Amino acid sequence: TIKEMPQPKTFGELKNLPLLNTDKPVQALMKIADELGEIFKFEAPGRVTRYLSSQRLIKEACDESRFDKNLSQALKFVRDFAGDGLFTSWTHEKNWKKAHNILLPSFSQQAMKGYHAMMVDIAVQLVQKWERLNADEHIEVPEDMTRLTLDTIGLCGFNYRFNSFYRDQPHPFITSMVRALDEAMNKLQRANPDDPAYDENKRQFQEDIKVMNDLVDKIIADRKASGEQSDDLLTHMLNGKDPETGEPLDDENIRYQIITFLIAGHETTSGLLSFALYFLVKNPHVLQKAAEEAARVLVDPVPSYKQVKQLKYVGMVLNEALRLWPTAPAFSLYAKEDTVLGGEYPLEKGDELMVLIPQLHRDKTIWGDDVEEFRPERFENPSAIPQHAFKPHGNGQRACIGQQFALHEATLVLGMMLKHFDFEDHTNYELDIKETLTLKPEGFVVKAKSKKIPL
């Protein structure tokens, strides 16, 4: 029962590459999936991949005995500054499992309890900023959630204060990081990337990587000269020992991990909080239920670790926001051996797949007809959700190491947000999703009305 898989429109020798010549390539790929179905072939000069959109097929793709993590072209470009850090290393490179073993303890329960106070530090700065707005001023939502999430990973992970709420413009790190991600995304469709027409792109890229590495240098220098005993993510990078190889990370890999965790440790969480607030103001009944939980649980001026763990409906709000708009919207796999997908699509060892997460999460055979609705109650019982239907944090041993960090931060922050403010979608905002490999609302603004509850 070997099927012929569909393929979107081609452009001669450029094959499908020009379909990526858009500012919104993930959303263009979702529209193609809408048209072609659960699997389609996508070719570029010298490369083939297959985009999967159905839980039927993706549940097989998530079999780690058959498929391993692949570096997509996007991750190969990001590797230019993230190196063999955890996000952009191959599973078989020695530094992947070594850094995984050394850094996994930085995301244990005990580690999260130790991060909690500094998460509150930044969260209180956010609440205070909004309490201090004048009447009819508004909140620039993705901008403020980036301030919050960047500052949280800086402080909790590295004892470094980006002081984003003291800035009306983005921290230089953010400016260069966004420009580097923009460049990597635009480079995806460049048929001749070495054409001198991109000399300036290349120079700018190098400049943005330097800016990013200069901050890394400062973070490292401050820690090794410090007279305060820390026990954070950076402590583990500098001192942790891999039980298997027995070795600590070397200096070159440490710098890659710092870059990796500064970027991965905030960008996707700012997208999540932005989408979550968007869906909450667009679904006032859901907002009310979540606000009622926040009021009942957050009975102290400062939330505790234990209280955040009881914000269970807020947790489902965030999972439902990750369902509709997972902020790292795809991951890539390669076949470890010859194998057949879904009884219909034979693959050879080395063949590549892309998992198109926002389309997987719209599989009507899993979620039902109401798939576009924002209904956090879908997550009331994980046992009622089929295997591999919900993959916003990737798969298997290569799943997101920071998942608990992200969800604790986002649960804490959204809980305080709902405890302290009413929110108004005063412009009737039309969702506009900006792509920088990752996904985030653009131009999303709201008004907040203080409940005047002291901190």
Ligand code: HEM
């Ligand atoms: C809601 C926020 C987040 C989302 C949606 C998310 C999503 C993902 C996804 C899908 C992957 C797999 C990528 C692939 O297979 O190519 C991944 C990997 C990773 N994420 Fe996250 N992430 C989030 C937050 C974080 C945070 C806060 C950190 C750091 C504190 C983090 C650190 C990482 C790292 C290090 C990896 C690579 C893991 C490995 O392969 O060993 N992420 N994330």
Ligand SMILES: CCCCCCCN1CCC[C@H]1C(=O)N[C@@H](Cc1ccccc1)C(=O)O
């Ligand atoms: C950084 C965390 C999010 C990463 C998401 C990456 C996911 N891409 C973000 C933008 C679009 C999407 C994607 O489909 N990319 C493919 C594109 C591609 C396929 C075949 C040949 C050439 C290029 C790729 O990068 O290989």
Ligand SMILES: C=Cc1ccccc1
């Ligand atoms: C370098 C890794 C990364 C991770 C998430 C978003 C952008 C970049």
